[PDB]
């Protein structure tokens, strides 16, 4: 097998993806500020057993980038993935989501359980956990300083991109518990992805559509069906973006069997820091 | 007896409470306070000085001009310069907490002739803030609410709804002892918060002076050294300000300087150890 790049129309947008392997559809969904490439250490190994598909989400890298905050609501992003499963000629998929990819995955699974065989979450809080607990967690609000920063128009784009995205490289490198995690080559590939016209605005629109202060401080209770598909949560405990307050007590959200694998020596980018152990836990979960 | 007054300064009318005679001693509050934050110091200090505690531009009984740009630091410092003049004085002892401290540092730096001695409670030097914040994860995290405050309307709504429950919570979370404010206190604060235009005006301080353009500026900030004797009082358990921002304050002061640390107090040091704070202030001055 060899890593192939494709494009497919889904839900009115053209979505780029890399793919390798045959078998069950296994989706790997990245978050901010990543793209398919974050999955570089898992694609080959998983492709031994599965039809691995790693897309660029709406707004990222080679995928279409519709204009306006409203086009980045969670409901539309989950519909993109539902549409992608269909367009790949399948009824369901194993769905693995990191970060925004995880939030989307939780949403897809909750509202369209028939389309998801098994769910894997890496370092992505359950949306109802986030909406309920964040306003009550000083620690989370503090960690979410940058979420508030990203609400403001234009200024965050300018600050993040200036000097060849120095600010963004720093934010990323500050978050890793492993040194020299991105090579100079890696950083050049990331900058190409970041530099795609409209990408940075589109990425930041995720926070403006879904995590504005109105949603965070809403008094209204959030309607979110229980998760009814077998679920694995992988969690690097040294996460600079997410408090443990947000991942404890998943019971009230998940009716199907679930398990949580804590990585006490990893942070947010658990798939980069223990690539082989993550790959293993994912394989074992699917194949048993 | 505590007297309330109004005076025109720099084109705005400013309310203040006053007690005592002697040297002019200004007490300047910050967010989300007003003159009333000084309740435990005014009487004792009034035994030796002409204590004046104003409501800053936008707060309580003082005028509240509309528009972010009317809350730039340069305008706020000019308000205090004007207040010294309008009280018939050439200079004052200036004590500043929080925003009142930031204003105090600015007045002292750019108008040293107007300030006899400077006292700072839990207020970072503006150049320290502007230089260090973008390099301090800890400070950026503590400053989550500064970014929150940048957005129009929504922060006003969230802070004020349910009788300012969110703001009361923010405040009470910041105290090192809970049950610091009586039910009466909280009602007095709500009256001040509820003044028409007050909450927008208070939040304009952050929109004018601590927007992301300023925080992440690459340009260096020119700020004259402090040339007047300075006392910094500092509650170390400050939820708003990292110690990263207060180390080497000597590099900003070309005059006698001293820092009194209160390791068991937080941001509102003047409420938590009111008597000790009053003492340190008196001594410093009368010396």
From TrEMBL, chain B:
Keywords (alphabetical) are: Hydrolase
Source domain of life:
Bacteria
Query: Any idea what this protein is called?
Result: Alpha/beta epoxide hydrolase
Q: Which organism is this entry from? A: uncultured bacterium
